[PDB]
């Protein structure tokens, strides 16, 4: 998911729209934008589909005000295509709205706490609504008006003690301002920016990625620190505070692997550069370990893999050819009574340039291998195209565990790498040869861009969750959400 | 514009829908599909928008039949966005539908002929409607029913003798079958494919690009030769006949340069390979002419330019780096009361990776330059990013002339290279150095993939129109049309 928040001195709707357009790659399932108009009332518009689908002229009209936050969703367990999208909001205390990217590992607990102690009803399965409510109830502990920045930081701190997992949020509070905070572990991305209009009138902005600041002409100030809370008042003043106890930087290694746009700088690290380095490391490993076999060309599997494979091709000193072209326009498949000769699912996504495979032992490069069904077919497609030997190289290490901090992944039992050795996986997908990026390699490659970061969040590879609170009782609860999501979507 | 036609032994609506999505790059203004149902009646659905927007479940359900044609439009003169899209259909004689990619230079004269000799009214300005009525008019010369393949071909030849321009056409005549033909010069792209169901049944299909055959699992048969016609009966019989005098192969050069997909093989030439070749020619040329320039990095402008730039960087022995990222999703700007318009952005379509320009002399590579408006802003961005010297290389030569063969292009007036010298253009766009590919070189690059092609269609570069019927007078006519087009679109 991706979030944006702009506190400006002029109408923020188009900016929030444009900003979401460049964050669109973080979730195309749904989109929402909410602003505070001249009368101190929220103006909301959220629905499923791309940003362009969701917002029309009549919708932009009503999205009045000089401050608003936006969100683009990625379907997950607890928030399917059918569920209510973000941002959510409550009218008390004062009127709060919030959008978030990340996942609360103690969500269930919190829903219970909220009901028993605060009698606060959570109407959806979105942990975003829970988070908004915990935050809301904490602000309810201040009897006087208006609130002082500390109050808000107190609330935020309290919230950090109560919730667990990964999160990067932005929210607004009527009559006061806009706030944004990152989890104590700095797992989920969040950056701050500004844009001076004139003498003493700066507009501030926060977003999941730097590309949102760029596209709007905002000056990149810095990343929001782990456990830190930012608060911009309605008068344009920026305040900050450390709201966590033991803040640590354990950036999500996946953001760098393929989820984030390569022109983004996350925690002083360039996604593009990081990826190139991944090609260097993998290319070196391949030269070392696959010394004897004869590959004739390196072929990336769109999209992420392009620059990485190029680097590997360079290291291997072999030609790089664009063998697969991605079908940028994917249509809907209509269920019609007797779909005679259907189109191959894989071909729905990619197309193979026959000329690049004929009688060539090819080496395909992909950012990651999750299910393997896909992988198996891509390999199959290559053999169909005329490739003698088809070898696969993954830029990411074996994905063995599901992500519970913000990235939608299938259950541990669906991940083909879970409980399998490289050679088995190779046989299941039919690759003549398979090879993965070693985890420490991947780390060095990213860490090279910023040695200050000493540990990354990489549980999907090692099964080590920085928050420690992930268990099967919890993993199974996520599956209950997913099931209700599937019956809801199936119902539709 | 792109076209597709399938003569199948089972429903074709989803397949045609599938085909058009991989040809979506050929036109995104409007889409249309038309099938002949079990009752020998036309099933049509056509509207403005992408294929995935025009076709909803209820429409697909109506599109019943085992034979149909599809069309994705790119707005041109006469066929503005507000204009009725394709396919078009006449109820007589027999019932004919036609969809085409190209343009008729003698359209205006033909429209007059139709009215005076056949009292055939043309409701739109789309030359396709004229092409259809001409064809219809020719088929109206036959008494006996049904029509023998000979009558259809004779009719097609008669048509070829009256119309002039470039055109790849697909049409269906009720109770008979589908016919496809290519202009006598072989300008517009058209391929034939086949899919074998069993011993006694085969489905055939035609498309502007082979990528459409590829995706539907059709075996590539061959390109439809210039002046040739293809007839596929409702019973599955394929007929081919040469319907033009002195046909010659002059494939459109712009297809290979930018218009077509890299994974297509237009007239035996792989678009990808042609593109890579262009980078060799341009790299060598730069290495020769720009011998003393300090070029720190080769940065391609997405996306056509990527693989080309890669080649140039190899030739120059300079590092290739992704300094520009194309925002895959783009939205519309809104007309709201009171707000200020800031409708002047390439930043909406592109984002610059700052770190890749800082204190560097960059060589920006683009596929072509038309109005120069884009390139100016691209160069500006690169300067904003901190680049010292900004040089520009254009994969295509100077576009000084308007295209009148199916490819949309602004009037000569809006063409920056029209009436200007390289240096002059460089000054207008603010580049430190500007270099274009030599036309003869471009020809080598493409011709290298298929030496049998003597001459190509280069009018946009040299002003030589292979149909020998274009002159200032006619050019003015096309502009009066663009003025009518504007008004209809401004109106909506
Ligand atoms: N006829 C065309 N219509 C639209 N875009 C084009 C066309 N020819 C080239 N382009 C693209 O537009 C850029 C040139 O446009 P302009 O700056 O308007 O001259 C190139 O990078 C191409 O991607």
Domains of chain B in sequence order? 1-275+401-411+446-490 (3.60.20.10), 276-326+349-400+412-445 (3.40.50.2020)
**Preceding omega of B412 cis (within 30 degrees of 0):** no
Closest ligand 1 atom to residue B408 Cα is: 1
The partner residue sitting opposite A343, judged by closest CB among B55, B60, B215, is: B215
Backbone phi and psi for residue A104, each to the nearest 5 degrees, phi listed first: -90, 115
Cα B72 from Cα B126, distance rounded (Å): 14
Backbone phi and psi for residue B202, each to the nearest 5 degrees, phi listed first: -140, 140
Could you tell me if B136 and B90 are in contact, meaning their C-beta atoms sit under 8 angstroms apart?
yes
Task: Please count the CA atoms within 13 angstroms of the CA of B177 that sit on its side-chain side.
Answer: 26
Whose tokens are 């926060």? That residue is A206
| Of the candidates B484, B478, B483, the residue with the CA atom closest to the CA atom of residue B108 | B478
Q: Cβ(B258) to ligand 1 under 6 A?
A: yes
**Which residues, in sequence order, are CB contacts of B434 under 8 Å at separation 6+?**
B391, B392, B393, B394, B422, B423, B425, B426
Cα B379 from Cα B364, distance rounded (Å): 8
Inter-CA distances, B410 with A216, B74, B416, Å: 30, 13, 10
Tokens for A109, please give them: 């607990």
**DSSP assignments along A430-487, one per residue:** T-SEEEE--HHHHHHHHHTT-TT----B-HHHH---TT----HHHHHHHHHHHHHHHH
The closest residue, in CA terms, to atom 1 on ligand 1 is B409
Ligand 1 centre to CA of B374 (Å) is 8
Could you tell me if B396 and B331 are in contact, meaning their C-beta atoms sit under 8 angstroms apart?
no
The closest residue, in CA terms, to atom 19 on ligand 1 is B370
Could you tell me if A295 and A318 are in contact, meaning their C-beta atoms sit under 8 angstroms apart?
yes
Tokens for B467, please give them: 């149909």
The closest residue, in CA terms, to atom 5 on ligand 1 is B370
Q: Cβ(B370) to ligand 1 under 6 A?
A: yes
Q: Cβ(B394) to ligand 1 under 6 A?
A: no
What's B255's DSSP letter?
I
Inter-CA distances, B206 with A348, B18, B35, B172, B322, Å: 19, 14, 15, 12, 37
If DSSP codes are grouped into helix, strand and coil, which group holds residue B242? strand
Inter-CA distances, B163 with A276, A348, A472, B54, B106, Å: 54, 38, 73, 31, 6
Cα B260 from Cα B208, distance rounded (Å): 9
The partner residue sitting opposite A325, judged by closest CB among B14, B263, B328, is: B263
Closest ligand 1 atom to residue B407 Cα is: 1
Cα A3 from Cα A100, distance rounded (Å): 6
Cα B194 from Cα B6, distance rounded (Å): 9
Cβ-Cβ pairs closer than 8 A, A with B, add up to 147
Report the alpha-carbon angle A19-A24-A26, nearest 5. Answer: 115
Residues of B in contact with A57 (CB under 8 A): 334-336
Whose tokens are 């072999």? That residue is A318
| Of the candidates B327, B72, B338, B374, the residue with the CA atom closest to the CA atom of residue A51 | B327
Cα A252 from Cα A457, distance rounded (Å): 5
- Bridge partners (DSSP) of residue B161 are none
**Preceding omega of B146 cis (within 30 degrees of 0):** yes
Pocket test for ligand 1, best of B302, B303, B374 (most atoms within 8 A of CB): B374
Q: To probe the interface with A, which of B322, B354, B381, B384 has the most A CB atoms within 10 Å?
A: B322
What's B135's DSSP letter?
H
| Of the candidates B172, B302, B167, B289, the residue with the CA atom closest to the CA atom of residue B227 | B167
**Where is B365: in which H helix or E strand?**
strand B362-366
What's A76's DSSP letter?
B
Tokens for B406, please give them: 């199916």
Residues of B in contact with A327 (CB under 8 A): 21-22, 215
Catalytic residue check, A306: no
| Of the candidates A81, A169, A4, A107, the residue with the CA atom closest to the CA atom of residue A404 | A107
Q: Cβ(B366) to ligand 1 under 6 A?
A: yes
Tokens for A79, please give them: 């928030």
A297-300 sheet: strands from edge to edge: A297-300, A362-366, A390-394, A433-436
Inter-CA distances, B298 with A54, B347, B362, Å: 38, 20, 6
If DSSP codes are grouped into helix, strand and coil, which group holds residue B357? coil
If DSSP codes are grouped into helix, strand and coil, which group holds residue B21? helix
Ligand 1 centre to CA of A485 (Å) is 44
- Bridge partners (DSSP) of residue B100 are B169
Cα A9 from Cα A336, distance rounded (Å): 52
Ligand 1 centre to CA of B468 (Å) is 26
Cα A329 from Cα B21, distance rounded (Å): 6
- Report chain A's C-alpha Rg in angstroms: 23
Helix, strand, coil percentages (3-state) for chain B, rounded to 5, are 35, 25, 45
**Which residues, in sequence order, are CB contacts of A121 under 8 Å at separation 6+?**
A115
Environment class of residue B168 by beta-carbon count within 10 Å: exposed (0-12), middle (13-18) or buried (19+)?
Answer: buried
Could you tell me if A262 and B322 are in contact, meaning their C-beta atoms sit under 8 angstroms apart?
yes
Could you tell me if B297 and B319 are in contact, meaning their C-beta atoms sit under 8 angstroms apart?
yes
Ligand 1 centre to CA of B377 (Å) is 13
Cα end-to-end span (Å), chain B: 22
If DSSP codes are grouped into helix, strand and coil, which group holds residue A4? strand
Which residues of B line the annotated binding site for Mg(2+)? Answer: 304, 366-367
If DSSP codes are grouped into helix, strand and coil, which group holds residue A5? strand
Could you tell me if A16 and A24 are in contact, meaning their C-beta atoms sit under 8 angstroms apart?
no
**Is the backbone of residue B367 left (phi > 0), alpha (psi -120 to 50) or beta?**
alpha
Cα B488 from Cα A323, distance rounded (Å): 43
Q: Which long-range contacts (CB under 8 A, 24 or more apart) does B281-284 make?
A: B281/B437, B281/B438, B281/B441, B281/B442, B281/B444, B281/B445, B282/B308, B282/B311, B282/B312, B282/B365, B282/B393, B282/B395, B282/B435, B282/B437, B282/B441, B283/B311, B283/B312, B283/B313, B283/B314, B283/B315, B283/B316, B284/B315
H-type alpha helices, B252-353: 253-254, 271-289, 306-316
Report the alpha-carbon angle B209-B213-B214, nearest 5. Answer: 100
CA B77 to chain centre: 14
CA quadruple A126, A128, A132, A138: dihedral positive or negative? positive
| Of the candidates A6, A338, A370, A13, the residue with the CA atom closest to the CA atom of residue A180 | A6
Residues of A in contact with B215 (CB under 8 A): 327, 343, 347, 351
Residues of A in contact with B271 (CB under 8 A): none
**DSSP assignments along B329-352, one per residue:** --------TTPPP----STTTEEE
Backbone phi and psi for residue B385, each to the nearest 5 degrees, phi listed first: -70, -5
**Which residues, in sequence order, are CB contacts of B50 under 8 Å at separation 6+?**
A329, B24, B28, B31
Tokens for A321, please give them: 């050819």
Tokens for B400, please give them: 């000084």
Inter-CA distances, B437 with A398, B282, B290, B307, Å: 46, 6, 13, 16
Pocket test for ligand 1, best of B254, B299, B368, B381 (most atoms within 8 A of CB): B368
Environment class of residue B229 by beta-carbon count within 10 Å: exposed (0-12), middle (13-18) or buried (19+)?
Answer: buried
Residues of A in contact with B211 (CB under 8 A): 325, 351
Cα B367 from Cα A158, distance rounded (Å): 56
**b/e per residue, A430-457, with b = 16+ CB within 10 A?**
bbbbbbbbebebbbebbbebbeebeebb
Task: Kindly provide the resolution of this structure in angstroms, with one decimal.
Answer: 2.5
Q: Determine the residue of chain A that is closest to B64 in CA distance.
A: A336
């Amino acid at each position: 998911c991706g979030i944006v928040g702009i506190a400006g001195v002029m109408p923020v709707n188009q900016s929030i729209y444009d900003a979401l357009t460049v964050l669109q790659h973080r979730g195309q399932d749904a989109a929402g934008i909410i602003t505070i108009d001249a009368n101190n009332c929220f103006r909301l518009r959220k629905a499923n589909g791309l940003v362009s689908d969701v917002f029309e002229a009549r919708h932009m009209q009503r999205l009045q005000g000089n401050m608003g936050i936006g969100h683009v969703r990625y379907p997950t367990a607890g928030s399917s295509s059918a569920s209510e999208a973000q941002p959510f909001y409550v009218n008390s205390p004062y009127g709060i709205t919030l959008a978030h990217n990340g996942n609360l590992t103690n969500a269930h607990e919190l829903r219970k706490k909220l009901f028993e102690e605060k009698r606060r009803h959570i109407n959806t399965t979105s942990d975003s609504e829970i988070l908004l409510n915990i935050f809301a109830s904490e602000l309810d502990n201040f009897r006087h008006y208006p609130l002082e920045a500390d109050n808000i930081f107190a609330a935020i701190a309290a919230t950090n003690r109560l919730i667990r997992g990964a999160y990067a949020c932005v929210a607004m509070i009527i009559g006061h301002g806009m706030v944004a905070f990152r989890d104590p572990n700095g797992i989920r991305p969040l950056v701050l920016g500004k844009r001076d209009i004139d003498e003493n009138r700066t507009e501030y902005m926060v977003a999941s990625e730097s590309v949102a600041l760029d596209t709007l002409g905002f000056d990149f100030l810095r990343d929001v620190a782990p456990g830190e809370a930012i608060y911009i008042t309605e008068e344009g003043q920026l305040f900050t505070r450390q709201c966590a106890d033991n803040p640590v930087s354990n950036p999500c290694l996946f953001e760098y692997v393929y989820f984030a746009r390569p022109d983004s700088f996350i925690d002083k690290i360039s996604v593009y550069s990081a990826r190139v380095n991944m090609g260097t490391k993998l290319g070196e490993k391949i030269a070392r370990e696959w010394e004897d076999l004869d590959i004739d060309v390196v072929i990336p599997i769109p999209e992420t893999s392009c620059d990485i494979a190029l680097e590997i091709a360079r290291i291997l000193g072999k030609p790089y050819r664009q063998g697969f072209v991605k079908n940028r326009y994917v249509g809907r498949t209509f269920i019609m009574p007797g779909q005679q000769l259907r189109r191959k699912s894989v071909r729905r996504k990619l197309n193979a340039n026959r000329a690049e495979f004929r009688d060539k032992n090819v080496l395909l490069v992909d950012d990651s291998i999750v299910r393997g069904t896909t992988s198996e077919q891509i390999i199959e497609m290559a053999r169909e195209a005329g490739a003698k030997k088809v070898y696969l190289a993954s830029a990411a290490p074996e994905i063995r565990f599901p992500n519970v901090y913000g990235i939608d992944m299938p259950s541990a039992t669906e991940l083909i790498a879970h409980g399998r050795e490289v050679d088995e996986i190779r046989q299941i997908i039919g690759a003549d040869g398979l090879i993965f990026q070693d985890l420490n390699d991947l780390i060095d490659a990213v860490r090279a861009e910023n040695p200050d970061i000493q540990q990354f969040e990489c549980s999907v590879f090692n099964g080590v969750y920085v928050t420690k609170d992930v268990d099967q009782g919890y993993l199974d609860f996520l599956d209950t959400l997913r099931n209700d999501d599937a019956k809801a979507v199936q119902r539709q």
